[PDB]
Every structure is written in C-alpha cells, then in structure tokens.
Design a protein that fits this description.
Layout lengths: L2 H18 L3 H14 L4 H13 L3 H17 L4 H17 L3 H14 L3 H11 L1
Subunit structure: Forms a complex with hsp-1/hsp70 and daf-21/hsp90. Interacts with daf-21/hsp90 (via the C-terminal MEEVD pentapeptide).
Function: Plays a role in gonad development. Up-regulates longevity and thermotolerance. Binds daf-21/hsp90 and inhibits its ATPase activity.
GO biological process, one term: response to heat
Length: about 130
C-alpha cells in the first residue's frame, strides 16, 4: 500500500531474523515497531503470538491471537490467517492445561478454515 505499510513489513523482516536466532527480546522490539507503523496487518500479531508461545508465555500468546482475530476481521484479512490465530490460541490453552478453552478455540478455528489434521485432533481431545 504505502510508505508506512512497507516500513512496517521491513521491521517484521528484522523481527523474523531475531526470531530465527532465538533472540526473542529483539524479535518483540521489531514486531512492536511493525505494529506501531501499521497496526492493521494481522501478520504482526500472529508473529508476536508465535514468539510468546516459544517463550512459554502462553497467556500473552492467547492475547495476541485474540488481537489477530479482531484485526483480521476488521481489515477483511485472509480468513486462513485468522484460522491460524485460532488454532495457535487453542494450542496455547492446551499448554495451560485448559482443555475447555483449548477446545473452544479449536472449534472456532475449524469453522474458520477446515484443517483436516485438526479435525482429528479435536475428536481425540473430546473422546
């Protein structure tokens, strides 16, 4: 789109390079800068969620998944990337030993985009 939205992407790319080295602090710095430049881009919220998940900050991961979903809907982003946020949230809830919330999110995710592996995973979790 514009000078700002390109600038944001460039910060995301810097965040990914830190993320790839497991420098999670620096990854957040850059993704935060991305969101500062262009808060309408779902990718930044999902990438921050992914960092939080690897840090075992599962409640923060969920919070950013929730942001991705809200942003994704407001901006009419690719519904598949909204589904990804939803499954990530489900996984973060599993890691918190919260099956109830995990399954709520997984069902959201499947309704957003039918992931064949997740369908099987959810049936197993509901056994």
């Amino acid at each position: 789109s514009n000078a700002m939205t390109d600038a944001a992407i460039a910060e995301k790319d810097l965040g990914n390079a830190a993320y790839k080295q497991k420098d999670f602090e620096k990854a957040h710095v850059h993704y935060d800068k991305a969101i500062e430049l262009d808060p309408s881009n779902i990718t930044f919220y999902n990438n921050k969620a992914a960092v939080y998940f690897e840090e075992k900050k599962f409640a923060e991961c969920v919070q950013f998944c929730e942001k991705a979903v809200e942003v994704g809907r407001e901006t009419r982003a690719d519904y598949k990337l909204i589904a990804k946020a939803m499954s990530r949230a489900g996984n973060a809830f599993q890691k918190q030993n919260d099956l109830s919330l995990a399954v709520q999110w997984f069902h959201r995710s499947l309704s957003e985009f039918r992931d064949p592996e997740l369908v099987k995973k959810v049936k197993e979790l509901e056994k």
